[PDB]
Every structure is written in C-alpha cells, then in structure tokens.
Design a protein around this ligand. Structure first.
Ligand code: 3PE
Ligand code: 3PE
Ligand code: 3PE
Ligand code: 3PE
Ligand code: 3PE
Ligand code: 3PE
Ligand code: LFA
Lengths: 605, 504
C-alpha cells in the first residue's frame, strides 16, 4: 500500500526514457520499456488492492511534499486511496496495460514507436495523478496532463494536417472545460479556504448555512469541467474529430483515461453536489440529453470509429444520468464495464482497419465474418455488451443498475430517456455490425483481446467496485419493480437488435427509402453533423476569433502610438520651410518677432 | 557589501572583454563567461548566506544586505544599494540569463566581439543595478544607462538578414520609448523629492525617507502616473508595447540581447518596490484602470501572437500577454497574487529564454523565420522540435512547469479580490493555449511548405543542448517544487502587501 507513488513514478520513468531514447532503440526494447512500465504499474496496483482489502478497505493517505504554501493557501502533493480511487486506478492500469500490449503489436513498423509509447506512458501517469489526488489542484495537474497527452496522441500522425487540427480542437475545447474547472477551484478556495476533498466536504455545510449561491456556482463550474473532459453537452464536439488518431489512442481515451475523468470528478465531489440538488439534477439532465443526441448521431454515421465515438458519448451520458439520480455505485459500475467493452470494441475496430486495407466506409465492406472471424466474435460480444444484451453481458447489469437507481429516486423522465437511449443503442450498434460484417465480400494482441472478451461478458459484472463507505448507497427498488424494470430493459434491447436485423441484414429497401426521403435526408444530414453543434461553435467562436485576428494583425495600437512620430515629422517639415535661405525674409521674421514680443508685453502689462 | 561587486563585476568584466581581444578573437567569450559565472556565484552565495526562508515580515524598510556611499551630496544622492528576497531572486535570474546569453553567443568569432561582450556585460550590470538601487536617482540612472548598449547591440550586431535601416529604426523606436518614459519617471521623482523637501527641509533621494511623504490626493496620483508610465513602457503594457516585437525581431540572431535586457522584468519589480509603497492610495484608486489594461494586454497580446507569421514576434506578443497577467496581480493587494506574480516573472523569464534560444538555433539551421516556409520539422531535426514543444507547453501554463504555478496563484488571489477580471483572464489562458498550439503546428507539424524544410538539418551541439536542458530542468523543478522560491520572496512580498493595504 506504501507503493502508491510507484503507479505514477513507473509510467513517468517510462515516458522519460522513451522520450530521451528518441527512436534510437529497437522496437522490442521500446515495447519492453513502455509496456513494462504500464504492466509494473498494474502489478503494483494489484498489490495495492490486495493490501487495501487486507486492512478492511480503510482509506490510505500518502503525502509526499507540500506543493504550495502561501499563508492560508496550502496545497499538498498528497495521494489518497479509497474504494473509488482503487476502482479508477485498477481500471486505468489494467485496461491501459492491455491496450499497451495491443499497441505493442499494432504499432509495429510505424514511425515514432518510442514516441507513441512515451506519450501513452505520460497519459497513464497523468490519469493516475488525476484519480489519486487528495485535493483539487493536484487533480487539476492530472487533468491538464491528461488533456495534453490526449492532444499529443490524437495528432500523432503529424504529417497529415487534419490530425493536427483535430488534436488542436480537442485541446482547445477541453481547455475551455479546464477554465470552468479553474473557476470551481477559485470559488471553493475563496469560500472554504481549502481544496482537499474531505476538508471541503466537512467545512461546506457550516460555511454555507446562510447562503448557498457560491456553492451552486462552484458545483456548476465543476460540472462544466466534467462535461469538458467527458465530452458531454455542451463541450462534446471534440470526440468525433479525436477519432483522427491511432486506434489504441482511441481505446485509451474512450475506455481507460480521458472520458471517465468527468465522471470521476462528479463522483469524488459528490458531497458538494448533494448540498446543491438542482445542480445534481442538471448533471442527470445533461447526461440524458447527451446520451439521446449521441445515440441519434451514432445512428447515421458511415464510419466505425465515428459510431464508436458517439457510442462512448452515449455511455458517458448514461454515467452522468446515474450520477444525477444519485446512483453513484451504478455510475462507477458502468464506468468499469464500459471501459472493458469499449476497449474491446476499439481494439477490434483497429484490427478490422488493419485487416481490410486502410480506413473505409462501412458500406464499402460487407460479409466480413468469414474472412476475419475472431475479431467478428470480439465485435459481436462488444456490441452485445454495448447494447446491454440481458443475462450474458456486464453492460446489461450496469445499465439495469443505472435505470433502477433512476426509478427508485422518482426520476421517471430520466429513466424513460435511458430506456429510449438503450433502444437506440441496440439500433445503431447492430446496424454497424450487420452492415460491416454481414453481406457480400468486396500472441501479443490475441491475449488482450481474449481478456477483454471475457471481461465483456457477465464475468465483468462479477467484479464489484468496493464503494462501501465512499459513496452513499442508492435506494433499493421493490423486488417486483426492479423485476419488471429488468424485463423491460431486456425486451427493449432484444427488440432493438431484432429491428436492426430486420432493417439492415437483408436488402435495405425501407432503410434506403427513409434515407432518400426528403425529411429523412434532412434528419440524416442534421444528425450526421451531430445536431449542428460544430457548425454553431465554428460560427460563434472560431470565425470571430479569426476575424479579429485578421483585423488586428497590423497592430492598430502600435500605429496609434506611432501617430506622434508622424506629427513630429510633419511639423518639422513645415518648420523647415521658414529656412528658405533668404536674408530679407530673415530680417522680416526678426521684425515680425519684434512686433509679436512688443504686442505680448503690452497685452500682459 | 557584496552588492557593489554584484554591479561592478559585469562592468569590469565587459572592460576586460574589450581589452583582451588583442590576445585573441576567441578570448572575450571566456572572459564574459567567467564574469557572468562569478556574478551568478556571488548571487547564489548571497542566497545561501541571506537566510531568506526564516526571515519574517518586519515592515518596509527591511533589507538583508545594504550598502551606502555618497555620490552627489548636494542633492542628497547616494550610491545606495539594498537586497531583500524579491531583488535577490531577480538578481539570481539576471545572472543565470547572463550566463545563458554568453553561452548562446559562443560561436560569434567576429572581429569586434569584444565590444559585443562589453555591451552585454554593461546591460547585465545595469539590470542588476536596477534591481539593487534604493536611491531614486541611482535607480533611474541604471534604468536609463542599460538602454545605450541595448541600442548599439540591436543597431550594429542585430539581425543580419534585415537591412541596416530596419535595425536602426527598431533600435531608435525602443530607445525613444524607454528613455522618454524614463524622463517622465524622472519628473515624478523630482517632484516627489521637492514635495518632501518642502515638507521637511532636507535633500534626499533615498527611497526609505521618501516613503513617509505627506501629499495631497492629485499630486500623488500624478507622481504615480509618471512612475506607471515608465513601468508600463518597459513592462510592456498596451498601448505602450509596440517597441517590443520590433526590438525582438531585430535583435542579434542568437538571442543574447533577448535574454540580457528584455526578459528581465524590471518594470514589475519597479511597480512592486516603488509604485505601490511610495503611492499606496494613488495605486489603490488606479487599480481598476491597471487591471483592465492588463486584461486588454492579455487578449491583445494573444491575438497578436496568433496573427504573427514570424516566430520571434509571436514570442514577443506572448510576453505581452503574460505581463498582462502580472500587471493584474500587482494591483490586487493580495499576498497570494503577489507570490504568484513573482513565480510568473521567474517562470516567464525561463520559458521565454528557452523559446528565444530555440528560435535562434532554428534560424541558424533553416535561415528563415517565416512559419509559412517551414512545416514538418519534427522529422528533420533531432532535438529542437521536442524542446520547442516543451517550452510551448510551458507558455500555455501547463502544470508541471512554473508558469502554471505563477498564473494560477495570481488568479487565486485575484479572484479573492476581483472576480470578473479573474474569469476574463482565465479565458485569456484559453487564448494562450490557442497561440502556442498554432505556433507548434505552423513550425514543426504538417508537411514541408518550402525547400529548406524538406531536408535533414544538423542537430544541436552539446552546449546548446546543455543550456536548453538546464532551462527545462529549472522550469520543471519550479513547477513541481516552487516552495524555496516562495520562501525566498515571502518576507519582501509580505512587507510590500502590508504597506499597500495598511495605508489605504
Ligand atoms: C507527475 C505525473 C505527470 C502529471 C502530468 C504532467 C503533465 C505535464 C508534463 C510537462 C512536461 C512536458 C510534456 C510534453 C513533452 C513532449 C516532449 C516530446 O515530444 O518528447 C518526444 C521526443 C522524442 O520523440 P521522437 O520523435 O522519437 O524524437 C524526436 C526526433 N527523433 O523527445 C525528445 O526528443 C527528447 C526529450 C525532449 C523533452 C522531453 C520532455 C522534457 C520535460 C520532462 C523531463 C524533464 C527532465 C527530468 C528531470 C526534471 C527535474 C527533476
Ligand atoms: C508520485 C509523483 C512523483 C513524481 C512527481 C514529478 C517528478 C519530477 C519532478 C520532481 C521535482 C520536485 C521534487 C520535490 C521533492 C521534495 O522536495 O520532496 C520533499 C519530501 C520530504 O518531505 P518535506 O520536505 O517535509 O515536504 C514538505 C515540502 N514543503 O520528499 C519526499 O517525501 C520524497 C519525494 C520523492 C519524489 C520522487 C520523484 C521521482 C520521479 C522520477 C521520474 C521523474 C520524471 C521527470 C519528468 C516528469 C514529467 C514532467
Ligand atoms: C453555449 C456555449 C457553451 C460553450 C461552448 C464553448 C466552445 C469552445 C470553442 C469550440 C471550438 C474550438 C475550435 C478550435 C479549432 C482548432 C483547430 C483548427 O481548426 O485549427 C485551425 C487554425 C490553426 O491556426 P493556423 O496554423 O494559423 O491555421 C492553419 C490553417 N488552418 O486554428 C484556429 O483557427 C484557432 C481558432 C481558435 C478559436 C478559439 C475560440 C475560444 C472561445 C472560448 C469561449 C468560451 C466561452 C465560455 C462561455 C461564455 C458564455 C457567455
Ligand atoms: C501613456 C502616454 C503618455 C506618456 C508617454 C511617455 C513617452 C514614452 C512612450 C511613448 C513614446 C512614443 C514614441 C513614438 C515614436 C517612436 C519612435 C519612432 O517611431 O522612431 C522611428 C521613426 C523613423 O523611422 P521611419 O518611420 O522609417 O521614418 C523615416 C522617415 N523618413 O522616427 C521618427 O519618425 C522620428 C521620431 C521623433 C520622436 C517621436 C516623437 C516624440 C514626441 C514626444 C513623446 C512623449 C509622449 C507624448 C504623448 C504620447 C501620446 C499620448
Ligand atoms: C510630455 C511628458 C511629460 C508630461 C508633462 C510634464 C509634467 C506635467 C505635470 C503637471 C502638473 C500639474 C500640477 C497642477 C497643480 C499645481 C499647483 C498646486 O496645486 O500646487 C500644490 C503643491 C504646492 O504646494 P504644497 O505646499 O507643496 O502642497 C502640498 C501638496 N503635496 O504642488 C506640489 O506639491 C507639486 C505638484 C507636482 C505634481 C506632479 C507633477 C509631475 C508628475 C509626473 C509627470 C506627469 C504625469 C505623467 C505624465 C502624463 C502623460 C504624459
Ligand atoms: C508633438 C505632439 C505630440 C507630443 C506631445 C503630446 C502632449 C504631451 C503632454 C501630455 C500631458 C498633458 C498634461 C497631463 C497632466 C495634467 C495634470 C492636471 O491637469 O492636473 C490638474 C490636477 C492637479 O492636482 P490638484 O487638483 O492640484 O491636487 C490638489 C487637490 N487634492 O490633477 C488632478 O487633480 C488629478 C488629475 C489626474 C489625471 C491627470 C493626468 C491625465 C493623463 C491622461 C493620460 C493617462 C491616463 C491614465 C494612464 C493610461 C495608461 C498609460
Ligand atoms: C531563479 C531560478 C529558479 C529555478 C527553479 C528552482 C525551483 C526550486 C528547486 C529546488 C530543489 C528541488 C529538488 C530538491 C528538493 C530538496 C528538498 C530538501 C528538504 C527535504
């Protein structure tokens, strides 16, 4: 348990070694250093979990040094480990290790192998810092490190400028989220005098007994930071473009590290949200709206990576819905299970891309179960877990827990939105699966695929996160109520899969009739561009920024301050006309000056 | 007692740099290196012997070291030097940047580099004298003396690619800006001295005696305005900033002029040391104007940096934005914001030094500074694009670098004082990330946009790599462990803050 800092130090050492190697080492040595750093972090995490369960799930605090100390402003470089922290650390280290082995197989023969593994090691270290921090500023260090590593890894193929544009857009949108998070940090320090999570929770109800306005502002800004990192409303526009990077980058961003940071932030600061119930309801509403919009967007995508990105947005919306209905255990459970099956789906999609030429439209391929069957099976159980196939997948149990928590607290509208989103999830998932894999044809990586294959089944649901004593328990439904809830969710998922089979497996006559219809074409164009949010942000933020830059590029203030120089030049040129060289004019000017001096003396006498 | 030698070792070293050129043309660089290393060693020895961490705030004046000598006794003018924690940090940074400026001009083996090194050492000695002088005439004297070798270095040793007329114009614009603003400050100093003489009857330019000067509101505002005009020109504060990208663009290509007397924040130190304690009420009334000027500086400098096609002008406008943050911090009256301003000054010096040195090396490799003629330079160079990526990550305020510590403590204290200005400034941090990523993508990523960027380039040598990696290590250590720096400046910053808020 005293090796808690090793989970940061080993990925940091891996990043430093692989960065300063600069591609000089061989592929095997670079793979050994990177994958072994993440694997040693995972092994230390396993030992930490065994020690954590040895002393009865007691919270362990390991301070290292004091980061900042200016009077009452005291920020510590301290790590903490509770059940939520252990769950996030285990998910991050284990899933990142599996993705690292798959990337060691996958990135063979590519330029920047060691640079890729240095960046992923820094990503792992940043996320471990994020989830292990005991105060908000150290968690902000992990937050920005995760955002920077995401920017470095999305634009990994730097020669294509559109990869760099996608990475820049992801960094800028997430930095807007980080600015909202910074606002939350400023408000919380100004009110409570501390940024330690436990200390803020203790000191909040005494300080905010008179007024609660600043606490509502702080929780609203915390939600803004969370939706920045988790790609929710209204900062969700970067994920589908962040698909520009390599496949293990997408697996790391969507399963292990990046999009789960907002869910972890809301769950960690759950007490402050519990004292602001309207903001928590807003968290749930944002999750519901985001999952509905993401499902509708994923319904009409023509790319596997875009479908998986909007599916990730929908599942993070499910976790935000669980947080907003005060089903915290369900949110973390769905976080872990979604990490499993989304990592499996993204690695399977990368194997598909490697096997079938370059990246392609989904309608170009077809009948791919015969050629590449093991990755078809991986896609099958990944989509079954994504669509919450009952009694055989962990995603079914996670979504059932979320919906039961929504129903038990009286959030009927959020539960209805979750059921509709589950129907659409089955629809888009098996639409993509049946289009890509059905139709007419036109050991370093097998082991992570097998492990994520097993963890996407009910074996993943057998793992229970130890959130006793960290998060409050959700209210239990009546046995009949959760029974019919389970039957309704399973029936909705099975009906959605059957409708996807009826719509896309055979000759898509009704689907093509709907798509070519004018309202259908309009709705498909609207949902394909993710409801026009990218267009709105380009018109509202990007275009006036570029316009003001073009208007200011000549430095108008510099010219305004250069005005006295041109005035001096003009006045000197005008005064030099008096020096015409004529003696009679010099005499006349002397007499003019005599007249002026005499008149001035007589006026002011 | 060592403070006169802290000023005099650069001057004697520059004289020896000029004098030793007859012994060989590779000699004056060694003399300059030993001179700046001796100055840095004396500064570090003063840091060790000062005991700044255990020093408590006793009120202005409180000096860890002091030196006095009569200079012009008719006006009560003395060579009066004094060091405390803030000035000690500034002097240590000056010595380190002077060593880097000597090391960066190591390969210039021309026929008149003795005069080059003499001008560099005279600039560094003038900067140290600015940081040490607590006599107002002596402070003004150093403030104006360090601009003549600046003018001559830009005008004669500047950017060789540009025409001579462009270098003359940039040097003249810089000199006119700085010296006219200094003369306005001299008018304010003289009027303050005359007010004190009318109140008491003695001739003094001593800053300790001029602190207790009773004056009406309106006189104090005008004296504050003269001081602020000088500091705002040299900070820079918009719209008195236009000299800075021109001076940076026509500075010598290695960038020793950039490090030696531009990236040392004498104006923020002057605002903290002189403007706030001498005129606390006038600064309190001026605070909203100065904060909004800082906000405008942040966003204007960010937009100007984005619009640049030259890297040097881009980095100069980044300096404008970060100094806008420091200017916001100075007028808060918050101890946390002041400590953040100190950290931001040091970290910006380090990060901008790294950026300017890397830009000079890139210009040596590719012989152009237009970003439209490069691209994809990550695949062509060995060390430079990765270190440039690290330094661009530093100037956007990434945690793990000292820039984040600086501006985030600034924003914490400022939100404790002024919330609206703080939230607008954090959106300024978003703008900073925008311009840093834009420069990185224009220079090193993408494909080659010309012929010079499409070929393999020679790697960095051991000396350039050593100084860049030293800056990297210092920035990372400042980001992760800023506590010794905060403990060094804690007493002086506390004295200034207590004087500012106890007299308002
Ligand atoms: C606390 C846990 C983490 C928490 C979150 C932290 C987030 C903020 C971290 C800030 C540090 C900077 C992050 C970004 C650095 C990017 C550098 C980079 O791209 O390095 C890769 C590059 C090798 O790439 P490659 O393409 O193979 O080679 C180039 C040409 N052949 O590499 C190279 O070419 C060589 C190396 C270049 C510089 C590498 C980074 C320097 C800064 C970090 C190490 C500093 C030194 C260590 C000691 C510090 C003091 C104790
Ligand atoms: C976990 C995260 C660790 C890594 C963080 C980043 C590492 C790189 C930069 C480190 C620079 C700062 C180090 C500070 C060490 C220090 O002062 O520790 C003091 C502490 C003793 O306690 P005390 O002095 O009482 O603390 C109160 C302080 N006001 O001392 C201790 O308790 C011991 C602390 C040991 C720290 C070891 C860190 C090893 C890092 C190896 C990889 C380096 C990677 C460099 C690049 C990183 C990315 C930019
Ligand atoms: C209801 C609203 C809720 C909140 C919504 C927040 C939306 C945040 C902004 C989303 C859009 C960000 C898009 C960033 C794209 C970056 C990638 C890109 O397109 O790069 C192109 C360009 C590169 O620059 P360059 O190299 O010069 O050009 C080469 C040629 N292309 O680079 C550029 O063109 C750079 C353009 C930068 C634009 C930055 C705009 C920042 C605006 C922040 C506003 C925050 C508002 C907070 C809420 C306020 C409420 C009143
Ligand atoms: C905050 C505002 C109030 C306080 C201000 C304090 C003063 C310091 C800060 C402001 C200084 C502004 C200086 C503006 C001019 C800068 C110098 C310059 O541009 O020099 C270059 C120029 C020659 O270059 P070029 O354009 O090529 O001309 C060739 C012509 N055949 O050179 C020339 O053309 C000749 C230039 C002669 C000198 C310039 C005029 C000086 C006038 C007095 C300045 C004092 C402030 C006056 C009020 C300013 C506005 C409020
Ligand atoms: C072009 C660039 C340079 C700018 C132009 C040159 C400077 C112009 C300064 C204008 C000053 C106007 C003063 C108007 C009132 C004068 C009469 C008066 O009321 O005198 C009162 C007082 C003398 O009586 P006393 O017994 O001393 O009263 C105690 C009060 N302290 O009087 C005193 O104690 C003396 C008061 C002196 C006030 C300060 C004067 C200089 C201030 C710094 C420079 C101006 C501000 C910055 C530049 C502006 C933009 C360019
Ligand atoms: C070749 C052409 C181009 C070159 C040349 C251009 C022009 C150069 C000259 C420019 C300066 C003009 C004079 C400015 C100072 C005027 C001073 C003044 O009017 O003072 C009146 C009064 C004096 O104070 P009094 O009332 O006597 O105090 C005792 C009562 N308690 O004062 C007061 O009561 C207080 C007044 C406070 C404000 C006075 C100064 C205003 C300055 C405006 C610009 C700066 C604005 C702030 C900074 C912005 C950012 C730099
Ligand atoms: C003026 C230039 C400043 C550069 C940044 C310096 C930042 C401070 C670095 C101090 C050393 C940090 C690592 C060693 C810590 C030793 C702790 C001793 C007590 C336990």
């Amino acid at each position: 348990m005293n090796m808690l800092a090793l989970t940061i130090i080993l990925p940091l050492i891996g990043f430093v070694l692989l960065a300063f190697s600069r591609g000089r080492w061989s592929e095997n040595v670079s793979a050994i250093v990177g994958v072994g750093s993440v694997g040693l972090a995972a092994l230390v995490t396993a030992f930490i979990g065994v020690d954590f369960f040895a002393n009865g799930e007691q919270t362990y605090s390991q301070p290292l040094w004091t980061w900042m100390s200016v009077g009452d402003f005291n920020i510590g470089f301290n790590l903490v480990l509770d059940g939520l922290s252990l769950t996030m650390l285990s998910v991050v280290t284990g899933v990142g290790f599996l993705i690292h082995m798959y990337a060691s197989w996958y990135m063979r023969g590519e330029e920047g192998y060691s640079r890729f593994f240095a960046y992923t090691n820094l990503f792992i270290a940043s996320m471990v810092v994020l989830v292990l921090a005991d105060n908000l500023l150290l968690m902000y260090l992990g937050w920005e490190g995760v955002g920077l590593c995401s920017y470095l890894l999305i634009g990994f193929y730097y020669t294509d400028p559109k990869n760099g544009a996608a990475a820049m857009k992801a960094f800028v949108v997430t930095r807007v989220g980080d600015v909202f998070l910074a606002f939350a940090l400023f408000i919380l320090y100004n009110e409570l005098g501390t940024l330690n999570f436990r200390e803020m929770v203790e000191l909040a109800p005494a300080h905010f007994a008179d007024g609660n306005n600043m606490l509502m502002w702080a929780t609203l800004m915390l939600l803004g930071g969370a939706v920045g990192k988790s790609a929710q409303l209204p900062l969700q526009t970067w994920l589908a473009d962040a698909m520009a990077g390599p496949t293990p980058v997408s697996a790391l961003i969507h399963a292990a590290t990046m999009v789960t940071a907002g869910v972890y932030l809301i769950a960690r600061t759950h007490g402050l949200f519990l004292m602001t119930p309207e903001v928590l309801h807003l968290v749930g509403i944002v999750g519901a709206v985001t999952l509905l919009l993401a499902g509708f967007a994923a319904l009409v995508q023509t790319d596997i990576k875009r479908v998986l990105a909007y599916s990730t947005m929908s599942q993070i919306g499910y976790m935000f819905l669980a947080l907003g209905v005060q089903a915290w255990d369900a949110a973390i459970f769905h976080l872990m299970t979604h990490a499993f099956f989304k990592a499996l789906l993204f690695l399977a999609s990368g194997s598909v891309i490697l096997a079938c030429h370059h990246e392609q439209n989904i309608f170009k391929m077809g009948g791919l179960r015969k050629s590449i069957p093991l990755v078809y099976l991986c896609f099958l159980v990944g989509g079954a877990a994504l669509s919450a196939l009952p009694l055989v997948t962990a995603g079914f149990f996670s979504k059932d827990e979320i919906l039961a928590g929504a129903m038990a607290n009286g959030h009927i509208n959020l539960m209805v939105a979750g059921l509709v989103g589950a129907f659409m999830t089955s629809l888009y998932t098996f639409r993509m699966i049946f289009i890509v894999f059905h139709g007419k044809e036109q050991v370093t990586h097998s082991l992570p695929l097998i492990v994520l294959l097993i963890l996407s089944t009910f074996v993943g649901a057998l793992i229970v996160p130890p959130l006793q004593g960290v998060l409050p328990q959700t209210t239990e439904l009546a046995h009949g109520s959760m029974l019919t809830l389970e039957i309704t969710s399973g029936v909705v998922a099975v009906v959605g899969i059957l409708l996807a089979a009826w719509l896309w497996l055979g000759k898509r006559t009704l689907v093509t009739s709907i798509a070519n219809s004018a309202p259908g074409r309009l709705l498909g164009t609207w949902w394909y561009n993710a409801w026009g949010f990218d267009w709105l942000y380009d018109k509202v933020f990007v275009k006036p920024f570029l316009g003001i830059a073009w208007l200011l590029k000549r430095d108008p203030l510099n010219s305004m301050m250069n005005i006295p120089a041109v005035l001096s030049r003009f006045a000197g040129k005008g005064l030099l006309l008096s020096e015409n060289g004529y003696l009679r004019w010099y005499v006349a000017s002397m007499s003019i000056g005599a007249v002026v001096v005499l008149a001035l003396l007589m006026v002011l006498r | 007692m060592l403070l006169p030698w802290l000023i005099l070792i650069p001057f004697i070293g520059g004289f020896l740099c000029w004098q030793t050129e007859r012994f060989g043309v590779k000699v004056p660089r060694w003399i300059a290196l030993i001179t700046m290393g001796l100055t840095l060693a004396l500064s570090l020895q003063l840091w060790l012997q000062g005991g700044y961490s255990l020093t408590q705030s006793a009120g202005i004046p409180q000096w860890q070291s002091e030196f006095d000598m009569p200079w012009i006794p008719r006006f009560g003018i003395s060579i009066h030097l004094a060091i405390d924690g803030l000035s000690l940090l500034m002097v240590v940074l000056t010595g380190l940047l002077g060593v880097l400026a000597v090391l960066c001009s190591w390969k210039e083996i021309e026929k008149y580099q003795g005069f080059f090194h003499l001008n560099l050492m005279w600039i560094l000695g003038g900067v140290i004298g600015v940081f040490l002088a607590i006599d107002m005439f002596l402070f003004f004297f150093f403030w104006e003396m360090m601009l003549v070798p600046m003018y001559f270095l830009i005008a004669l040793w500047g950017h060789k690619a540009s025409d001579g007329k462009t270098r003359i114009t940039a040097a003249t614009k810089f000199f006119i800006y700085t010296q006219a603003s200094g003369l306005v400050m001299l008018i304010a100093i003289l009027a303050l001295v005359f007010v004190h003489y009318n109140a008491t009857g003695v001739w003094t330019f001593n800053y300790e005696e001029l602190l207790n000067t009773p004056m009406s509101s309106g006189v104090e505002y005008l004296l504050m305005l003269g001081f602020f005009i000088a500091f705002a020109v040299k900070m820079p504060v918009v719209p008195l900033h236009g000299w800075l990208p021109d001076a940076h663009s026509q500075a010598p290509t290695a960038g020793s002029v950039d490090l030696a007397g531009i990236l040392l924040k004498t104006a923020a130190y002057g605002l903290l040391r002189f403007s706030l304690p001498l005129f606390p009420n006038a600064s309190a009334e001026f605070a909203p104007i100065a904060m909004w000027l800082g906000v405008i500086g942040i966003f204007y400098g960010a937009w100007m940096a984005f619009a640049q096609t030259d890297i040097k002008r881009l980095i100069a406008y980044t300096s404008v934005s970060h100094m806008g943050f420091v200017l916001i911090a100075i007028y808060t009256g918050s101890q946390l914001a002041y400590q953040g301003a100190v950290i931001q000054m040091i970290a910006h010096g380090l990060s901008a030094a790294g950026l300017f040195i890397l830009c000079g090396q890139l210009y040596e490799r590719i012989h152009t500074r237009d970003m439209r003629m490069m691209g994809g330079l990550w695949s062509k160079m060995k060390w430079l694009p990765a270190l440039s990526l690290f330094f661009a990550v530093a100037t956007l305020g990434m945690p793990g670098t000292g820039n984040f510590v600086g501006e985030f403590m600034i924003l914490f204290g400022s939100f404790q004082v002024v919330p609206v200005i703080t939230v607008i400034s954090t959106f300024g941090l978003v703008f900073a990330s925008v311009y840093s990523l834009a420069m990185l993508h224009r220079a090193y990523f993408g494909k080659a946009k010309s012929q010079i960027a499409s070929q393999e380039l020679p790697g960095m040598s051991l000396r350039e790599l050593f100084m860049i990696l030293l800056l990297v290590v210092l920035l990372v250590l400042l980001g992760f462990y800023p506590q010794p720096i905060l403990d060094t400046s804690h007493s002086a910053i506390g004295n200034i803050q207590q004087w500012f808020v106890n007299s308002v």
